Amino acid sequence: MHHHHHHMEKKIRVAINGFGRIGRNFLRCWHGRQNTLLDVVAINDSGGVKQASHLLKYDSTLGTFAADVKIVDDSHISVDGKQIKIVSSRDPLQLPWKEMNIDLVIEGTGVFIDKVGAGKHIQAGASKVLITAPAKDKDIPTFVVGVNEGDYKHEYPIISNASCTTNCLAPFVKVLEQKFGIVKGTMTTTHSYTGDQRLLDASHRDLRRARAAALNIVPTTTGAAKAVSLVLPSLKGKLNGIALRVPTPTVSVVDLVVQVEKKTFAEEVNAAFREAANGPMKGVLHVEDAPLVSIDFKCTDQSTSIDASLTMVMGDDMVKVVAWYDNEWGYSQRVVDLAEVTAKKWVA
Amino acid sequence: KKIRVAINGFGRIGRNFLRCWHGRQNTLLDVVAINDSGGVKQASHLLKYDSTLGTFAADVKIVDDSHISVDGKQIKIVSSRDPLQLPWKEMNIDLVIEGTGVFIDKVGAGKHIQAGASKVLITAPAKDKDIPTFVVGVNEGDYKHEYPIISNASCTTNCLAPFVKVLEQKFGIVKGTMTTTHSYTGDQRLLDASHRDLRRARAAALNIVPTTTGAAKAVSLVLPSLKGKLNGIALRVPTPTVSVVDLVVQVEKKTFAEEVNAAFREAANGPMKGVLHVEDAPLVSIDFKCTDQSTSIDASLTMVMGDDMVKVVAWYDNEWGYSQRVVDLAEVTAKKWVA
Amino acid sequence: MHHHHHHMEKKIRVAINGFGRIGRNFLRCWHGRQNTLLDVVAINDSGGVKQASHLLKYDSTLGTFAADVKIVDDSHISVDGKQIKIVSSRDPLQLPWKEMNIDLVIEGTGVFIDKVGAGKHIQAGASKVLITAPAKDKDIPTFVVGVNEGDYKHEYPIISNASCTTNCLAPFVKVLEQKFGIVKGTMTTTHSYTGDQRLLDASHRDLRRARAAALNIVPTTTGAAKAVSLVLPSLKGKLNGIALRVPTPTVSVVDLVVQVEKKTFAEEVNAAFREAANGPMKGVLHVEDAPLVSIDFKCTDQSTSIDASLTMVMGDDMVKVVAWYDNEWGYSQRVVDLAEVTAKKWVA
Amino acid sequence: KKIRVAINGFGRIGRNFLRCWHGRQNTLLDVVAINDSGGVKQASHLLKYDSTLGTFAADVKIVDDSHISVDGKQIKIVSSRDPLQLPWKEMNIDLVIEGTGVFIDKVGAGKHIQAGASKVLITAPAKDKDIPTFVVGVNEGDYKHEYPIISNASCTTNCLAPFVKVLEQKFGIVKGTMTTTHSYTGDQRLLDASHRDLRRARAAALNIVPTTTGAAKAVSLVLPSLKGKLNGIALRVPTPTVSVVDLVVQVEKKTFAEEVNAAFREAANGPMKGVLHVEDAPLVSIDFKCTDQSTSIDASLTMVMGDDMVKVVAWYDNEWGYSQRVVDLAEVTAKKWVA
Ligand SMILES: NC(=O)C1=CN([C@@H]2O[C@H](COP(=O)(O)OP(=O)(O)OC[C@H]3O[C@@H](n4cnc5c(N)ncnc54)[C@H](OP(=O)(O)O)[C@@H]3O)[C@@H](O)[C@H]2O)C=CC1
Ligand SMILES: NC(=O)C1=CN([C@@H]2O[C@H](COP(=O)(O)OP(=O)(O)OC[C@H]3O[C@@H](n4cnc5c(N)ncnc54)[C@H](OP(=O)(O)O)[C@@H]3O)[C@@H](O)[C@H]2O)C=CC1
Ligand SMILES: NC(=O)C1=CN([C@@H]2O[C@H](COP(=O)(O)OP(=O)(O)OC[C@H]3O[C@@H](n4cnc5c(N)ncnc54)[C@H](OP(=O)(O)O)[C@@H]3O)[C@@H](O)[C@H]2O)C=CC1
Ligand SMILES: NC(=O)C1=CN([C@@H]2O[C@H](COP(=O)(O)OP(=O)(O)OC[C@H]3O[C@@H](n4cnc5c(N)ncnc54)[C@H](OP(=O)(O)O)[C@@H]3O)[C@@H](O)[C@H]2O)C=CC1
């Protein structure tokens, strides 16, 4: 009944450093949101407007972008008329983030993942950096939306959104820990290949990731099960696992085997997941009842799809859970989500 | 002294079996007949040329309308969908290798004996429970000549049972679960199409495809102390051969990875030599193609959590390694042959 | 200025026999049309409502159907509330087409492709059969939309929509013949694998199609270049070719080399194609100027996409043209189109 | 009598070259040095284990921090991105096999001679026109010891030139076009990523990928009568090795398929024995893996339209068959070695 303006949440100015699989999935995820607090104003692409526009528009995994993608001039593209600056520097110290008034950098290079490296963006003028990967520094806080994003504070200048596998695992591990308690467990992710692997046998520090990715099942170490304890500290020292990279281009599946404290059975485990999916983890955790295969989970927005018919309990307290995740697109929706959290908590 | 063998079902396992047999230094098996509905043209061609085994180095020829020859040795080719119609009495067949995936129960496999064979070796789990099952390196000393129909189990049970036997002896298994990440097989569809299993209906080279497995339960057929202790699942993936078992077990004796691996090495160097291998190099699936062992423990992947949760990862060539076990089990029947 | 009703074009009652790749692509193509003269009332699926609904909804090539797919009862599914009968007979003589008042059968089995076999549907009660494949009988008329569908007559009870490759070739061959004249030519299609090939080396009358399809380049004979003369009779005896099946699941590309009568150059050839694309072959023939790869042509509605930068002319009169086609989806749009022609010409 | 060889670039061609050389009965080549930036660990491992060639049967060992051994024969491993820094004077290197794809022009390849080598053989088309190009079976009799830098052309030109030589001799080529349906190579990306060529940027195992080829024009370097007569394109497809050339030519002499094939058989049985093969069996790409010839005409695919339009389809293992030609051309330099 009073004289007032309308509430304005402020949009933060975002730059994407590294316009790779995750950088380009992030842009399409953002562009498809009905409402956003993010204004993407800059992209660092070594190939300039030609490469940025082409690889944004045409995608072997996602299909052709329905949006109108145009080259505006020699340093701008537009997406449905919204212009975005293209910069091209390998050294973040050289990026114009002070001049462009950048609030948040999405670090999707896989290169600047510790405080010194990501901090170069802040030295260059940005206020905050969100690393799309596990941090290389123990003191960089890590967040998984659906698990611990309420512990985010505006006063963290550098943050990590963890790995795709940790974003799959941690929501349903949180449910297991809440309902049944975890003693210890192991995980194997059967994971699509990524650009870190080689197309044909070739140079790599990892002699297994050196091997032809579309021809092989390729074991590789993973920090993702240990990393769950960065977001669920009660799980410190309780989980470990491995990865098997296989000849698919996206979608992965986690197989977790945990010993729980409370004796249970498969229907009760699934009921705990369904309760979470319908409530506090809606949009992050899904329980799938149809008999599907990996490609059915392409471009799904949730972090975790429990394959309900595969849930198994052995000897009362050994619980096996199988969960699908689109390691590109679902993970990128979580990057958008965590960037939106930083916008919501931005301090005046 | 040698026994006369017919192969029924000249598919992936039937053809791997012939090439495995042909490469043996010494054998008590005389392969004399192959039932292939494509006749000499198809049998000769797919024996010689193989997308995963490569070209057979033997000279493969079409002799006449019902014989091929392999390095000069003639094999009769027959073509009947009905085993009752096969000439096994005429040809004095001792042993039928059942590689069709169809005649896997006691009535079905028994048709070969009705047609005149003496014994049938099913290259698969049997459907009914009174057909004895054997895994070479685990319980083949329990085979008896009086068994007219026997099973060599599945590829996954042949990989699992040898190293589960070691774990049970050394540490004691309380319970466990397994996943096999498994190459696609001919039961799955190339593009989405009719299948009684709606996941196996889906394009095999495009997908990770979950499917049931009987292999964790089947271990208890050859290792009775494992009754009720294991369960698991398969994930079929877009590779054409070589598979990998990931087993997680709770054990009685608290342990650590090096000690688990040491138990496997003792077995690989002794009583399971040739069946169980421990691999120390950092390899990938294709490196285990055409390996003769049933199981290759990937040593650097062994993990122990909380003292008594043991994770073991083991590779197996589900075509070639399994078919070497089929040859081995058939050789056992020859050694114990009486009548 | 007079008392009148509105014009009513009649919808023909359609049954799909063989709910395979082409049968299911046909249903989705039809369902996505803004306006149609086709009412799909029956599907013959050996697996009943469970298999028909599941494989309609979930598709490894097309992705998940956005439409609401439900099992209504033991012999009906619904798509966005529209109910469709599921029948399951291997012998078309046994299908209930008289009882269901079927106008047109889409024959997508690959089995009933000559007059006796397709004619079993007419004996069963249908009025017309459209074979989604080359006919096995020389006297069954063949049509390619964009080429000769004006020669269709209601009085043909059995018709063929030719093969996917002939639907790619014939529109742009028609342009070449019109503008430059064809002396003779050869073609190779580099073609996705199909369900006729084997997953691992296994039984087949064709010893090359016996071989593992996702591991190999697989030569196979093709009638598709000769078949162009069924729709363009001036080309009788002038074309032949081969197929190479490769490890992709859909989209194919035709490489045609023709000797022409009129001396020409690449830009002039492409200009003839662009004139056709913009005019009489709009929606059937497309000229693509971007540097794309096979998966960019997935789910494209045209029959033919000329890769303009690959057009080459050697020695004045040897013309090489490269054209992309989605052998499942584009072909199925042409099946819908040819069925719509039969509806338009239906005689009162 | 033997010449001392260094391999610069231990990639697919560098490693195929070593295995091809090692399998020769007789050789005038002594491979003494390999430049691999991953050192002995990487060079030994990727030489032993290979996703398309399979495991090397030779004993491969790490001797010390700068030597491996292959069946006991030691090879020095060096690691410099800059050829000027390589120890070729110290090691008395005669011939460098340039397998990097980088030092393919006269300045770049010349750095190995500046560093002390006498001769460089580029395993690729050269970038500038005064580097002589040779295809074994076509023009290697034109090689001269006085040429310090030579090219062995591309895999596609090695497949094309031998049978184009036969067509030109027997029928006369007026003009023609070619497409190669070619396995992916390491220049392409695994998933969509940066590339100067926006089609080679795209996921290689998911796509048919058009790309330019110099091979049809390059035939005129080794066969001057072909100047200006051919053009063509490549389609990269999701297979890891083996490729196929489809050539369509207008010829002078009217002919028919059996006569074209007969010309190829005459050449395969005579002056191109070992380089050109004519295949009569109905095979697929994997059957031509690890074949030693440069070209396998698929006889049943030869087609003649309108009397003078000839279509020929020829298979080639773009890794192994090409590397056997690299070995052959290096052996020619050894036979003609003076100083
Ligand atoms: N793919 C996945 O499934 C997931 C990946 N991640 C993580 O996301 C990050 C990126 O992975 P992904 O997108 O797959 O890899 P890509 O290789 O596709 O993307 C990496 C991008 O960074 C660019 N880049 C590299 N170095 C620099 C530099 N110095 N300056 C500017 N741009 C640079 C590359 O371009 P150029 O070619 O110009 O170097 C490329 O565009 C990694 O940390 C990865 O671990 C996280 C979750 C899931
Ligand atoms: N592939 C693997 O990894 C393993 C498979 N197995 C088991 O081995 C068996 C065969 O498997 P695989 O070789 O992969 O399958 P394939 O489909 O390759 O071989 C099956 C063979 O049986 C033939 N066949 C089918 N029905 C009949 C019949 N009525 N009379 C005669 N021949 C017939 C088929 O020929 P046609 O085309 O003429 O029907 C084909 O040659 C199955 O039981 C399978 O579970 C066991 C371990 C591993
Ligand atoms: N795929 C392609 O790219 C193109 C294919 N075509 C043509 O379309 C036709 C179908 O090809 P495609 O869809 O790929 O093959 P599919 O194998 O996917 O579909 C064949 C369908 O017919 C069913 N079927 C077979 N026999 C019978 C029968 N007696 N009664 C009822 N249903 C039956 C099969 O089901 P079941 O498993 O129950 O037998 C299956 O659903 C073929 O003629 C093909 O040449 C044309 C253009 C392009
Ligand atoms: N593969 C094929 O089918 C054929 C390829 N070729 C030609 O052969 C050459 C190599 O091709 P391929 O073997 O496929 O490619 P690879 O990428 O497999 O091998 C290239 C090798 O060169 C090394 N290398 C690159 N730069 C340097 C450098 N500055 N100093 C030292 N080593 C270096 C790479 O190691 P690092 O990772 O350390 O850079 C890698 O080992 C190219 O010219 C190609 O066109 C010819 C015929 C056929």
Residue numbers in the entry:
A (entry chain R), C (entry chain R): -7 to 1, 1A, 1B, 1C, 2 to 18, 18A, 18B, 19 to 34, ...
B (entry chain O), D (entry chain O): 1A, 1B, 1C, 2 to 18, 18A, 18B, 19 to 34, 36 to 60, ...
Quote the study on this structure.
Photosynthetic GAPDH is an important enzyme that fulfils major metabolic functions through its participation in the carbon fixation pathway. Unlike land plants, Chlamydomonas along with other green microalgae and cyanobacteria only contains homotetrameric photosynthetic GAPDH isoform composed by A-type subunits (i.e., GAPA). As observed in other GAPDH from plant and non-plant sources, the crystal structure of CrGAPA revealed that the catalytic Cys149 is located in close proximity to a histidine residue (i.e., His176) crucial for thiol deprotonation and thiolate stabilization. Like in other GAPDH, each CrGAPA monomer consists of a cofactor-binding domain and a catalytic domain.
The crystal structures of CrGAPA complexed with both cofactors NADP+ and NAD+ (NADP- and NAD-CrGAPA) have been determined at a resolution of 1.5 and 2.2 Å, respectively. The superimposition of the two independent chains determines a root mean square deviation (rmsd) of 0.21 Å (326 aligned Cα atoms) and 0.30 Å (335 aligned Cα atoms) in the case of NADP- and NAD-CrGapA, respectively. In reduced and oxidized NADP-CrGAPA structure, the well-defined electron density allowed the building of the whole non-cleavable His-tag (MHHHHHHM) at the N-terminal end of chain R. This portion disordered in chain O, breaks the 222 symmetry of the tetrameric structure which became a dimer of dimers (C2 symmetry) and is stabilized by interactions with symmetry related molecules. The first one is sandwiched between the methyl group of Thr96 and the guanidium group of Arg77 in the NADP-bound structure or the hydroxyl group of Ser33 in the NAD-bound structure. The 2′-phosphate group in the adenine ribose of NADP+ forms a salt-bridge with the Arg77 and hydrogen bonds with Ser33 and Ser188 of the adjacent subunit, and various water molecules. In NADP-CrGAPA, Cys285 is the most exposed (average residue and thiol group ASAs equal to 67 Å2 and 20 Å2, respectively), while the catalytic Cys149 is less accessible (average residue and thiol group ASAs equal to 9 Å2 and 6 Å2, respectively). Incubation of CrGAPA with NADP+ partially prevented inhibition of the enzyme by GSNO, suggesting that NADP+, bound to the active site, might interfere with the GSNO-dependent inactivation process likely through steric hindrance. Consistently, if the cofactor is removed from the structure the accessibility of Cys149 increases (average residue and thiol group ASAs equal to 28 Å2 and 21 Å2, respectively).
